[PDB]
Amino acid sequence: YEHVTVIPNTVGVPYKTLVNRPGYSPMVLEMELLSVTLEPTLSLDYITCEYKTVIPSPYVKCCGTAECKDKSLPDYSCKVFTGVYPFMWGGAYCFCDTENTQLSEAHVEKSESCKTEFASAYRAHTASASAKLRVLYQGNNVTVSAYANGDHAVTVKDAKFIVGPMSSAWTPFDNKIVVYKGDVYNMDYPPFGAGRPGQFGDIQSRTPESEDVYANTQLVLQRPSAGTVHVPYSQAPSGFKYWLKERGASLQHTAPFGCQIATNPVRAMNCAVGNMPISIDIPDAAFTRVVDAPSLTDMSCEVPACTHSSDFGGVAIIKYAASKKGKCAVHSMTNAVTIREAEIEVEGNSQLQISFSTALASAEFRVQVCSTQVHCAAECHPPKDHIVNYPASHTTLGVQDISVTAMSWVQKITGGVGLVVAVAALILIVVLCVSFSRH
Amino acid sequence: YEHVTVIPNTVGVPYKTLVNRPGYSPMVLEMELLSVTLEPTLSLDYITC
């Protein structure tokens, strides 16, 4: 028997689905998502890291003039400064006083740290969805790990589980992401080869080990101070270091829908988005015939207490007369009320206790136990606590669900006015009919 | 659960208050004043003898 149901993509919240195969006793499966992972396919555009500026010992050409040469190094700059009169600890370096030039050159290289400290600029593509589901089957809860793509069926305990596709293609990751370590950021990083000084991407390489380096640091060489051999320059500070200080919050802290973000691989986990279709192939051996199953009669329901606490704050006691010893599935006939127990044991004439959770001030629901339905009703109180550390076990209330006492007041007032109108309408109709008749 | 009730200041007479907390069986507490003391703050003016 192939059973197809849809559950919310909320993780850590169990949902009950009723399996109804005609001729067989109803069965209830409890399914809970333990983990949902969206893993984007990534393509690396480039690596951003701190740059180092390399400045070879300056060449001082004494009693003559130096010349520049053009090199292909990533951000090479070279200039000749005339009129230099450098001194060393032991005195003047050059014999000539004015016929002396200094050849200063510099270039930018990726630092030695770029193999460890770097940020990777990735392009994100359609994610592969995966999920871990806990299913309570035949009284035994089995963990199923499968891809949420409507394919890649996984069979456990001779039952085939197909999960997905996801009802939503939403992902916390944009087309362009940057990964530093455990922190993933959504930013429109610049094109490769088009980085800007002082900003993220000022120095770029395709891979950490690549020798192909782009750099735009505005490395302008300046004239040395008199009497010295130092090589001054004006260069924008690494945009990587600036970025590290100005990163802001990562997606782990900013993502919508409570998504958890992790790296290695990049993952979005437990996003409360949309829902997940599930199809279960249940073997015939898993079903008990209606004639073989216990049958209940003379059922009645009472509710000693109810609080709409969102934590199974209601308890119902149901009296029954069982035809024989055995087990019965239990299912709520309304979304308004969620019952914690999926199955109970029934023995002769006795009573069963089940817990339930509802948002309703007045709990009006029907409970089906192995094909026999009993109507339950209760007045539910509000909780005293304002805040809890767990998601509601029940669904939303809606406008259609109002307390019985309030409903009575609404009908009394509505009927009161409606009756006055009906009377006034009748009076006018009678007068019009009489006025019409007379001529 | 905070329960607020009021009893007479009469001493030696037990009073019963019902603590009705929905979801739990009703609890009844019996309270009796054994002693009530009003101790005035005094400032000595003088001694007569």
Ligand SMILES: *[C@H]1O[C@H](CO[C@@H]2O[C@@H](C)[C@@H](O)[C@@H](O)[C@@H]2O)[C@@H](O[C@@H]2O[C@H](CO)[C@@H](O[C@@H]3O[C@H](CO)[C@@H](O)[C@H](O)[C@@H]3O)[C@H](O)[C@H]2NC(C)=O)[C@H](O)[C@H]1NC(C)=O
């Ligand atoms: C199969 O397992 C599920 C889930 O239980 C979780 O996973 C297990 C492998 C263990 O690691 C558990 O520790 C873990 O919670 C069972 O459902 C859950 O069972 C636990 C108890 O094992 C319930 O928690 C208890 O709740 C009572 C309430 O009064 C507390 O007093 C206890 O201290 C404890 O917290 C938990 O509520 C329940 N889940 C739900 C939604 O009710 C499941 O019963 C089990 N099935 C079988 C056949 O083993």
